Amino acid sequence: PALVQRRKKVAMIGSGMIGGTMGYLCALRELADVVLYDVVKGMPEGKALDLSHVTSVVDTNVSVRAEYSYEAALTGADCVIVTAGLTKVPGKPDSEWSRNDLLPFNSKIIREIGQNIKKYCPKTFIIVVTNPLDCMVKVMCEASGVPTNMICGMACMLDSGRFRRYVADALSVSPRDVQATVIGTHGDCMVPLVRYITVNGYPIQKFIKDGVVTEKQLEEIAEHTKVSGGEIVRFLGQGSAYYAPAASAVAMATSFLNDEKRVIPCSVYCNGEYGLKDMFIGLPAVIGGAGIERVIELELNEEEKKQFQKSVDDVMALNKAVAALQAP
Amino acid sequence: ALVQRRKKVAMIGSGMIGGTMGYLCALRELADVVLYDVVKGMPEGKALDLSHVTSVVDTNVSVRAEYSYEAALTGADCVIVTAGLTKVPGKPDSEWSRNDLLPFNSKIIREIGQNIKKYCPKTFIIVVTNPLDCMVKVMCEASGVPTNMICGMACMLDSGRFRRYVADALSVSPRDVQATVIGTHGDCMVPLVRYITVNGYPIQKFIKDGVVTEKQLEEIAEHTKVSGGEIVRFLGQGSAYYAPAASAVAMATSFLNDEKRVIPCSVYCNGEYGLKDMFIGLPAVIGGAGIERVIELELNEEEKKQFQKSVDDVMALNKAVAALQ
Amino acid sequence: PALVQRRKKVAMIGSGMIGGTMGYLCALRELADVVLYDVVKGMPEGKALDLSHVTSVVDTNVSVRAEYSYEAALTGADCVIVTAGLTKVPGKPDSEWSRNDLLPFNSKIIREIGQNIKKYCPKTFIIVVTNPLDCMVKVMCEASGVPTNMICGMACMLDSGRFRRYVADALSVSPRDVQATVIGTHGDCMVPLVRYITVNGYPIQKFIKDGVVTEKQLEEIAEHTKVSGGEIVRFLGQGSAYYAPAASAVAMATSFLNDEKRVIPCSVYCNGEYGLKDMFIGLPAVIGGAGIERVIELELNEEEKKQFQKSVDDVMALNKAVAALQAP
Amino acid sequence: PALVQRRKKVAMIGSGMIGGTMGYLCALRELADVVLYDVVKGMPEGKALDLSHVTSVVDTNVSVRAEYSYEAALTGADCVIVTAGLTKVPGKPDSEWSRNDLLPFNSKIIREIGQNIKKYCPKTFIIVVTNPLDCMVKVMCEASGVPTNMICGMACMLDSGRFRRYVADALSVSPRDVQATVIGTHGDCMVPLVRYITVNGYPIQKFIKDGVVTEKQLEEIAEHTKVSGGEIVRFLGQGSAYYAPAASAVAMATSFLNDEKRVIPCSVYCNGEYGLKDMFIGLPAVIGGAGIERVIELELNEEEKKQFQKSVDDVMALNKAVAALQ
Ligand SMILES: CC(=O)c1ccc[n+]([C@@H]2O[C@H](COP(=O)([O-])OP(=O)(O)OC[C@H]3O[C@@H](n4cnc5c(N)ncnc54)[C@H](O)[C@@H]3O)[C@@H](O)[C@H]2O)c1
Ligand SMILES: CC(=O)c1ccc[n+]([C@@H]2O[C@H](COP(=O)([O-])OP(=O)(O)OC[C@H]3O[C@@H](n4cnc5c(N)ncnc54)[C@H](O)[C@@H]3O)[C@@H](O)[C@H]2O)c1
Ligand SMILES: CC(=O)c1ccc[n+]([C@@H]2O[C@H](COP(=O)([O-])OP(=O)(O)OC[C@H]3O[C@@H](n4cnc5c(N)ncnc54)[C@H](O)[C@@H]3O)[C@@H](O)[C@H]2O)c1
Ligand SMILES: CC(=O)c1ccc[n+]([C@@H]2O[C@H](COP(=O)([O-])OP(=O)(O)OC[C@H]3O[C@@H](n4cnc5c(N)ncnc54)[C@H](O)[C@@H]3O)[C@@H](O)[C@H]2O)c1
């Protein structure tokens, strides 16, 4: 008979570590049918077969397929999660790893994908993952032409996730009950908001006063959060983090697909908030069935504003450079 | 030959909340379940129905009714007690009061505690029976368990109500609303409006941004305080059970899986706020060692006043029980 | 901004034990927004409040609301699960409890609800629970006017669930790995297919030959399955089973909402199966996004056909009676 | 306060593709604390950090740690899942990929791990994944000395999963409702039991008669199942399957840890089934809190017996080869 309830469809544009991992979460949770697309042929088909086998093992039913063209991959996608691009610059020491160095390699890839989203699924919700994140979300926004509430970048949920894990270990509590947020650009200028940390809404200052943790410990945790990505790159040897990045992107996609209205910090379009316009930066936001439904403006004190401003400068300079170098 | 044994949770009281908690256990494959009650037949009916659920949802736990304390309690990793009454016989809904349940619920709780002492002294006890904070103390005295191994479920429910109302007002998921109620479960409970956060962000900025008003938050705190009576009035008979059951099982799961969740509940006071030898609702950390932390938040003038009234109420009920026996 | 992904909506018409329990599963699983409707004033509002509180406790976000008009309850419903009606005949001994006795009390209620579905949500998937089940599904089909693939009755998943639990206990295996099915009408004439029992696809006959279970043990399990409903009625004293019935109806609703294509025996429309036409009866079926997508016809031996024919004769007689007494 | 309820602990010995993936499942489901161990330094610490970050993201609380010594990785492990070893033979064309050729490189690795399990966690439940599977489980068995019911190898749940997925696609039903089993030795000689395929317990034969699937189609599906591992190796270019293998191993571990008593085909110790003794081969088994609680012997028809004997010959030759090596 005629299909009345159609499964959601999520397209993974980029089927490397993060793309395959997100496909895994979808199959494991029966969240949506999955399409894997990559410029590398053969590999997506292998992962799609492996992921299709997972559905039997875990008793779920979603279709996982590799698609070779942008048209087949993007058509009908409720959400498109983009991880296409490079993770490290070839021929460079891990000690010198920088997300900003990826700019010249990844801007063109992200722009091309955006042009195809405009053509095949202009109504989709786009979640960008490719680094340098905040810069790439802007490139994607310009190329895809989608409404600004229908595009965001995954980064701060991961940075906040790291921040929360470290605080949870220091306090001996579940990270479910630590609210710690990182805002700003995803990189060395990110801003872990130590002053705002709460444990089930209780101020972290209470735990400092009680003698469970010290300010020094918290600042060390904030620094650890900032260098966590590079730490994993150095330990892995090849590639970068993927389990938590994938879980973060899918958590965001799920808040959209199920209209959950979760409050998740992510790279979002600024139209005045914090005084910024025509750019994307990591800020707390509400993700629901209408995409980015609210961008939360936090009051920042002198030091916080100074840190955030540096973040703002990094991304504004990079965005200008990208605009300057863009092929007509 | 058995190396890994399933956890076992004993529901002492198999009425609305007891059966509902058994359902959560069967749905999540959390633990084997025993349903115990003084009413004959009913627990066997619910145990059968719940055993059928395991097939429907593809899980495998044992759900059985037991009519003896020895069979119900032996081997229990956690005992959740709901045995007792929900309303005073021959009393109007507009006169419903949790404190009026102190009469014989007190003897019921004492008997159960004596049996836990005998059959599963190493268990973690979660009391639900009203008047909650008062009954937890009776249970602690009768059972003899370490003070970190007993608590009462109340504030997670009150906090859940508080959170749902704030979430609706802000249009966000309640997962991201941290709102807490402390004190004694009743008209004197204390909703901590000052401590409401949205994913850790102070509610104060949402007020300034015009998302919610101060009057609206006050109304939400008041609604939280009377939510139980509201449900009692609407149901006509009995009281809430879905959220109370989910709260008790969330607490049991944090213990069984050593999660270390921060959950407000009725806990033993070892000097906090100058309180000793009593239980009252406070934020706590529940892990594999039971209650592992009790948080003593800084209260503002209004909260101190309200909390003192909560304390007066508890100490008076405890005084009353000491009068009975 | 404009809503793009709307949550599914399930209307519980009848907010008694089963209706409230199904609302609970929806809130626990973030499956759908829920509406509780009943002719009893007040009670649905109390349950809706309780269930809304559950969403905070378990960290989900769905709307649970009570509605007192058919229009508010049914409009926009992706799936309608109907439990409205009596469970026992007033003043009759539990020893004489019979689902068929409920016929004159529940037929008018089911017809009225169907007439409202026809007006308010003609594209919904209807799952009837009200007894006597197979007769009520037919009344609902005629009254609602929905396509025959968009209506079914929940019974055999429950009967089979019971059958499976008893066999799983006998073999000391998880019921996940016991496939046991009951077909026919939900009542004393239901047919537990002992011959078809499998353990992860392996025939039960091998477990008999190897001494794990006996023929009598299996016959007693089938008998226990048939009398399970009444056994619970007698133990409870008031009302009938609700936890497993609720889980079964929601499992069926989920297979439709998520287009899972699970194989679940349920009361479905017959268009030739066993020479049966214009009636509903419990049979294995595939439930997907297009509703009942396939009705499975099993080969029955002499004894099975005899038992099934008895089921058929009972429901056909009752369906004729109901039609003869229907208000003009 | 003294700890009363301790989380389960699962040790992943081998932190490559499958080991890290299994750690992911544990973190996502809050199944157990996880230890990642590997001979490669650095990488396990990187994966452990990444996985610890996942717990915050998905609101769970388990500890994920890398450990570089056997003592630290194995002590207190309720279950040990072993993937340590090689996936492909260096300098060997993918067109020539063979699990059997991995024997000389992995036999010593597995024996060493087994000796360490004996020393540090003799009461653990061992799940072996390293290829050639049935052969490696026997090596693990001899080296660890654990009770015969506390060791098994993961392979047939994965092969059956593939089998089930293809049948589910052909029938347009959820694979939850397809019961299809592969028994024997994990390799080109595995035995997909077509005759034992059921759809929620209903014989596949009726679906053939109803015209939903043909007999030829079912045979093609059995063939596809046999060559699925190599099909993925071919497409991937480097490495082999890991998502479904990881999910299968963890499903087995979960059936043990929560005493679920699921019926899962896996490589188990034979006490006379099919006249097989002192060896492991893939057979339907019940996995519960007492480990392998039952091994199911199915009646085989002529064709199935012929195919199964080839499976038996395959593993017996491998075990003979190992006895000759070490
Ligand atoms: C923002 C944040 O928190 C975060 C975290 C981790 C990684 N990342 C970035 O996410 C991206 C992917 O990481 P990964 O998955 O580990 O990397 P990796 O495993 O290398 O996969 C990237 C994949 O994209 C493919 N690809 C390259 N060019 C194209 C193209 N033009 N079109 C389609 N596919 C293409 C490539 O073949 C490869 O399979 C990188 O840019 C990372 O730096 C961001
Ligand atoms: C603290 C909090 O938030 C909260 C919320 C909701 C209900 N409660 C209380 O929880 C309790 C149970 O509520 P309910 O389940 O809805 O009530 P209900 O459905 O009446 O069940 C209580 C059950 O306990 C049984 N019982 C009575 N005496 C004994 C005894 N000596 N031993 C064993 N069982 C006995 C009784 O037969 C009945 O089945 C009541 O005291 C409620 O007031 C507390
Ligand atoms: C088929 C099967 O397996 C199965 C299993 C269990 C129960 N049932 C039946 O399911 C039905 C519901 O059982 P229950 O929930 O336990 O019963 P119960 O708790 O009594 O609730 C039925 C509800 O329907 C309400 N109701 C009555 N008339 C109307 C009306 N005109 N419009 C709207 N609501 C109305 C009534 O007020 C009550 O709240 C009964 O008919 C049972 O026999 C079937
Ligand atoms: C039975 C079955 O169905 C199945 C399916 C897929 C893979 N496998 C096998 O499973 C194994 C793991 O596959 P993978 O994870 O993809 O491979 P891979 O990613 O290469 O990881 C194997 C890991 O083991 C490590 N290792 C090597 N020697 C030792 C040692 N002595 N001690 C500790 N660690 C060591 C190695 O450094 C690497 O990190 C291989 O043997 C595969 O052939 C079996």
Side-chain angles (χ1 to χ4, degrees), chain A residues 13-19 37-40 43 70 83-87 97 102 106 109 112-113 129-131 133 154-155 158 186 240-242 245:
Chain A
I13 303 308
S15 299
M17 301 302 268
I18 299 177
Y37 169 89
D38 202 286
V39 288
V40 170
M43 182 271 276
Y70 278 124
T83 57
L86 300 186
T87 59
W97 181 75
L102 303 169
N106 297 344
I109 292 171
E112 186 179 271
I113 291 162
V129 179
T130 306
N131 267 316
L133 199 272
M154 184 289 302
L158 168 66
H186 184 63
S240 32
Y242 55 100

Side-chain angles (χ1 to χ4, degrees), chain A residues 201-217:
Chain A
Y202 314 139
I204 189 65
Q205 289 71 23
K206 187 61 189 181
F207 296 78
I208 291 173
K209 196 171 190 179
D210 275 351
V212 179
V213 67
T214 65
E215 246 302 303
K216 171 191 173 186
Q217 257 182 291

Side-chain angles (χ1 to χ4, degrees), chain B residues 30-228:
Chain B
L30 177 64
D32 283 336
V33 175
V34 164
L35 298 184
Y36 170 92
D37 203 285
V38 288
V39 170
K40 62 173 190 174
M42 183 272 277
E44 282 168 88
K46 293 189 179 179
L48 276 161
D49 190 11
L50 292 177
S51 76
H52 301 154
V53 173
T54 63
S55 298
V56 177
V57 304
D58 299 320
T59 57
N60 197 12
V61 295
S62 173
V63 184
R64 302 186 166 197
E66 295 296 345
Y67 293 103
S68 74
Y69 279 125
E70 170 161 33
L73 299 175
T74 298
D77 291 283
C78 180
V79 178
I80 311 182
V81 186
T82 57
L85 299 186
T86 60
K87 307 172 73 178
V88 180
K91 208 82 172 183
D93 292 311
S94 63
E95 296 179 55
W96 185 69
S97 174
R98 307 186 186 67
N99 290 347
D100 290 318
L101 301 173
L102 184 60
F104 301 74
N105 269 10
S106 186
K107 295 176 185 178
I108 289 171
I109 294 293
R110 184 180 178 192
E111 181 182 80
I112 296 164
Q114 307 179 319
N115 282 274
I116 289 175
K117 189 176 200 177
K118 185 174 185 178
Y119 305 113
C120 54
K122 302 179 183 181
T123 200
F124 182 61
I125 309 172
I126 294 171
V127 180
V128 177
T129 307
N130 272 316
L132 198 272
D133 306 278
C134 182
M135 296 301 93
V136 183
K137 183 176 190 189
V138 172
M139 181 64 72
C140 177
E141 306 180 320
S143 71
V145 302
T147 58
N148 58 293
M149 295 297 286
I150 171 158
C151 65
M153 185 292 295
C155 293
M156 189 183 193
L157 166 66
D158 297 322
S159 298
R161 288 163 171 169
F162 196 14
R163 288 165 64 209
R164 182 67 267 187
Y165 302 147
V166 171
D168 283 342
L170 304 173
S171 298
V172 300
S173 171
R175 155 65 180 83
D176 295 314
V177 175
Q178 290 76 50
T180 295
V181 174
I182 62 174
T184 194
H185 187 66
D187 298 335
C188 290
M189 67 176 73
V190 191
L192 302 178
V193 180
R194 187 160 72 72
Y195 284 103
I196 296 168
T197 60
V198 180
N199 189 38
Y201 316 136
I203 190 66
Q204 288 85 349
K205 188 53 162 53
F206 292 81
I207 300 175
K208 293 186 185 181
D209 291 344
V211 189
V212 62
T213 67
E214 294 206 14
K215 185 167 185 183
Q216 174 173 25
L217 291 177
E218 178 53 36
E219 298 172 320
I220 285 167
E222 297 306 303
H223 185 186
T224 298
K225 297 180 70 171
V226 306
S227 290

Side-chain angles (χ1 to χ4, degrees), chain D residues 169-192:
Chain D
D169 283 349
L171 300 182
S172 295
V173 299
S174 175
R176 153 70 179 80
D177 296 314
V178 173
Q179 290 75 51
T181 297
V182 172
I183 58 173
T185 308
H186 182 65
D188 303 349
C189 294
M190 68 178 72
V191 190

